[PDB]
Design a protein around this ligand. Sequence first.
Ligand SMILES: *O=P([O])([O])O[C][C]1O[C](N2[C]=NC3=C2N=[C]N=C3[N])[C]([O])[C]1[O]
Ligand SMILES: *O=P([O])([O])O[C][C]1O[C](N2[C]=NC3=C2N=[C]N=C3[N])[C]([O])[C]1[O]
Lengths: 77, 78, 1006, 294
Amino acid sequence: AMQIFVKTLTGKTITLEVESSDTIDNVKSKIQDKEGIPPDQQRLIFAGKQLEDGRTLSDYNIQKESTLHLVLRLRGG
Amino acid sequence: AAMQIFVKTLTGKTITLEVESSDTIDNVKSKIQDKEGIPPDQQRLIFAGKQLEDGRTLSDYNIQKESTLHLVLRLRGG
Amino acid sequence: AGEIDESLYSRQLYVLGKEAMLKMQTSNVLILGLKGLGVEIAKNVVLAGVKSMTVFDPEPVQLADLSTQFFLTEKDIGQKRGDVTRAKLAELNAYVPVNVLDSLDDVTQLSQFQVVVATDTVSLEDKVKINEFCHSSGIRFISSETRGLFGNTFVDLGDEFTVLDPTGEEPRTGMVSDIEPDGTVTMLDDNRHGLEDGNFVRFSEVEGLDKLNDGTLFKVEVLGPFAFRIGSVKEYGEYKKGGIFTEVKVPRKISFKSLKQQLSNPEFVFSDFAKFDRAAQLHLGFQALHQFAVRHNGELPRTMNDEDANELIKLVTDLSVQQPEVLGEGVDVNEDLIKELSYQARGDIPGVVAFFGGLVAQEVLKACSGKFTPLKQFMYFDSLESLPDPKNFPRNEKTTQPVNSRYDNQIAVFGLDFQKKIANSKVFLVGSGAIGCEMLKNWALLGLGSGSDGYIVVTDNDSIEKSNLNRQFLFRPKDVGKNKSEVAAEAVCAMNPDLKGKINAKIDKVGPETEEIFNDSFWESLDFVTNALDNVDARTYVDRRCVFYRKPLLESGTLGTKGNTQVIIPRLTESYSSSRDPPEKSIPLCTLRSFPNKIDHTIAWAKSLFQGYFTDSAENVNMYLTQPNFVEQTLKQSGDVKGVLESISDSLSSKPHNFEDCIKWARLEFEKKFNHDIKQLLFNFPKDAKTSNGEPFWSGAKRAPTPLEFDIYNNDHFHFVVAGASLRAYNYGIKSDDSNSKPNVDEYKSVIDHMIIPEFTPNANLKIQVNDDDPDPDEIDQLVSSLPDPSTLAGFKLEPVDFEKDDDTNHHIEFITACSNCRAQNYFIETADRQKTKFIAGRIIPAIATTTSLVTGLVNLELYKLIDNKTDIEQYKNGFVNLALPFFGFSEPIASPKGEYNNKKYDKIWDRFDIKGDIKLSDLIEHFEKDEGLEITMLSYGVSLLYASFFPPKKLKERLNLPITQLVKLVTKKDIPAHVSTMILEICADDKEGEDVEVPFITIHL
Amino acid sequence: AGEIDESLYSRQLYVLGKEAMLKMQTSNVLILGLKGLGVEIAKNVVLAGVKSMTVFDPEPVQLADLSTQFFLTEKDIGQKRGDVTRAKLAELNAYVPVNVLDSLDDVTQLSQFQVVVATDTVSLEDKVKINEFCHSSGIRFISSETRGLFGNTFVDLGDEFTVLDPTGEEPRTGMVSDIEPDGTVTMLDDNRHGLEDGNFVRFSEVEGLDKLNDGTLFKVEVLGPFAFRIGSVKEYGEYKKGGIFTEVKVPRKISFKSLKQQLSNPEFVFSDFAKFDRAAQLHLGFQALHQFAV
Ligand SMILES: *O=P([O])([O])O[C][C]1O[C](N2[C]=NC3=C2N=[C]N=C3[N])[C]([O])[C]1[O]
Ligand SMILES: *O=P([O])([O])O[C][C]1O[C](N2[C]=NC3=C2N=[C]N=C3[N])[C]([O])[C]1[O]
């Protein structure tokens, strides 16, 4: 019964309540309920790794108070 | 019967007071001292064209609830 | 650029700030119509400094336009108003180009401008067109009209406008003693927060709540004078100690409606709450003046004409029937008010034009900057009390008719006879600075003192300095160094040659030391007196004299956007001295000596160190060398004897011989003041030190200091040494190595690097005063036995420094700033720059032309009342203003206190007993008994007692047969200076029943 | 002036805004050292448009400097880096004068500038002196160094610095369907407010709560994706209908510490969180590089 943070590329900070056994899938859906983005479009990175749909928070050693980053690909240049 | 009136200062600050229509100006100045720290001798209050004098009541100046008094100053530059 | 000339704009800078003026310097302004109103607005805006000013007025000058247009001359008649005015506005401020717009047929040209101002010359139809183009294009729009004693202004800054600072007041700041988890903030001790509900604050130094200090703003809920609440703080942690809150002004977006919309649905700002029901009436009345004009081929009602007044009343009446909401359901047209508007429609009054000139010009500056709160959006004004009693000066189509005279549109209102009495008035104006120049301008336009029995005397002992130029519009850069009064008198006579030969410019200071010049004859010949001063003492002096000579006094003052007027009327009102103003805040000595927490404290300390080091020391040495009784006289008479004797000793024992010696001296003073003195204070009270109590000694207003390690690369360490060495050199007549250059860092560094700085050793028997309520401030024989004999020092002199804040090349502010900032470093206080240090140490008063001009306008509306000798106190108005709000308020003066003795009423301020001749004492006591029923009980001259009724017979026989002057000489043993023509005596007395009674004072006339 | 050329600055203007660029156009920038690092920094700042750019580098161009200094040629070998580069920087943007500072023996010259940047050509000793002068004089100071695949940067904007817009994002805005007496603001149908705790908002067009619309800011307490609370609004009246909220970005004051203080007590921003343990190692390392050179 822990808290983690999701910072977006725009500077916004989102707070989530999760248990360490939750899947990435679970987390992405919590982000949908909060931000409106659908899980297929979300890109979350933590400590050098991009988080993949089939795994758990535990598989990426995500601890309480950890901060994830929601990032985007930009189309200009 | 008790009412609220306002005191605006020359700096833009708005002070709220609770008074009865039978209070003296002295009374009112004392309420202003408790809130702003200014002493009654240094306060200058005007309402509707008149400067308020120490011996009189709010009624003498037809001050009604929600009325706004102005606390003003003499300036020293020029 | 991003550059602002402080030497020119100094006093305005402390009103508006750097960022507002930077915005003003990117703003192009356009003024339509250049009669009195437009030229007044243009003068104030050109003075303030905008990117450019453009004027449009293709109308030919006619004689009557000179009523308030101080830049038109009779030689200009026929030429275009805009062309002739252009060069004269240009002269006010070289930084502001002034251009003439030839034609306004193409409305599209308006797009070059950021702010457009439509004056009285623009038809209402055209105002609406121009406003629509401006509003829909993003251009700020303002208009204004004056008609006799009436006036208005309208402001429209568009759909989107952001106010950045609503008041211009210093942000509130304060020390915290506690923050509860629910967010209740408690002030330290007796300190009030001064906040208001909805204010925002940031924090710092709050230990235990760390991110509360990150600059986040909190909304303030006030609980009492000593507590406010910011919302729960449990989430940031738990309060331990410390904390300072700082108020932050947040942006505010506001919208304005168009002129069209507001003509039918106005938002009023009131100019006088006693008259608020007139705003709706005048709103209608001013629209009817324009309707009337459309029906009469552009013309306004004729002066004092009943037929036109009736038509105006009909037009206003048709408006209120068509829109019953504007006066209110069942509210009648105020016909007498509308009738006066019609009668005076053609009037052009200096006072009213000055009031609106200042106001509207300030509104322009707001529009350019987002500084201060804009007028939103209509204001109406009248000064009908200024009208004379029609018994004395009747008003009708004949008395009020034109005479082919620059004064015709003033005659239109007041009539000829009254205008002539203004001309024959005799006035004394005290001061010739900002108010002074405005006042002299107004009197020129009034023709005041131009008559055969009239004159003006103006006096001021100061010369013209560069910063004066920003708000003393009679002076030019070429005039710097000359005398304010003389220059001002010349300038005004150029505006109105009817005053040539009628203005006596004097350069004498007014006070007790100049009473031989400003003597009885002088004062007694005057009709009234006007103040234009910048200090309380001079005001009090003049007030006392106006009471003594029974002359009216017109008083006024400013501070930035704040201002006030006060009238003092013989036998009617209180005088100026009758009331108290709040005094200067005094800093406790222990706070200065040992425990500063504000930059104000380190600046005061620095300013004294400056006096001691470079002024007082030198003066003491010169006294020691030239006064053979000096040591003696000092042993008995001085507070700090050891102080003076040490000072002279050190000054003669460490004499520099070159500039390098001065550098070493300043480096060693740094060590003493910012290192050794601090280590000593810590030695007495270590950081961890506790109070008898058990709390930490270093808390609240006491900030534990740290000693400084000199570092030439620190700006304040460097400049302390540069300025200290250069000032020391000055004292000793040594030539600076910087006298023809900037200071070279590597060269100071070279000298300082070879120095041996002595180590610190504590004094274990030294003790330090912590509170102001406790004590302590052989050697001295020794100390005298170390003084050089003056014979050793023949012809030696030290040159004491005279503090001059406005010469950026003399090192003074440089010194006080570096010295203050070093102590601030000691005590973890944020350092201040030169502009701020100069403001505080120089006691500079923020000033700007707009406020000056407006307040002078009010004074001159009151002046009309003196000319009519009004005795009804209800006709007079003391005024109070803050253009930043904008706020205007007025009050009837306070009546003079009355007293009674026996059956006799008297005026406790203005009445006195006038005794002719150097009367014998017995004759005086007898007179008072027989003529006044008063048994004289005590009689005094100044401080000395001349008679009392307890004197025994022997002493009475000594005094009773003596003339007053001889009696004074018997008691004081001094003589009456023979230039004295009067003596005031105070008496105590008993009335007929034998009870003591307050009574008037006595004046003896020799 | 007070004037921005849109035909040139169009796409940049949508990034920074007029006000920020107007301030830029009053700022004089000095860059110390014109190897690759300095000329990259200078290239970008000149493109962006500042009041003026001044370059100081009296060292002779050597062949190796051409590794990353894209404005040097072999014809330039022997001549001073600063001089040779000045003219080429100047072509990037005709609105920005580019000057050369001949010498830096007198530190007082630094007072001409608003921002001073010290690159890899400046020794740690000179960096500290220069920073001390800048910090105590209110001049903004920045430094940077690259070494092989390593680099750092240091920022010190003084005791008092105000951030006027923290992110450059469009203010959030939305339509209101209800405002309850306790301050609860509910969104108009499936719209998300997007706000964050402690943002501020103002209102317009709210009927029944008239002084809510006067431009006063209210502090946002987020209740969920579809509602936020602003505190009681009883004193203001009773909600009837309509309303739009607009986020308002408020000024924020911050303080920076000097290079000297930060050398012993650094505040780190990480470049790669997978490598955070390395920041402290490298901060020691870069100092050691300077001790090595001494
Ligand atoms: O982001 P910039 O506009 O500065 O540069 C993009 C650049 O890419 C070019 N481009 C877009 N789409 C292309 C293409 N080049 C070749 N093929 C395709 N499909 C564009 O013209 C810009 O110059
Ligand atoms: O407010 P300003 O500084 O623009 O103008 C004030 C003006 O008054 C003069 N003044 C001060 N004290 C005086 C005096 N004149 C005559 N006598 C006394 N006692 C000052 O020189 C300024 O020019």
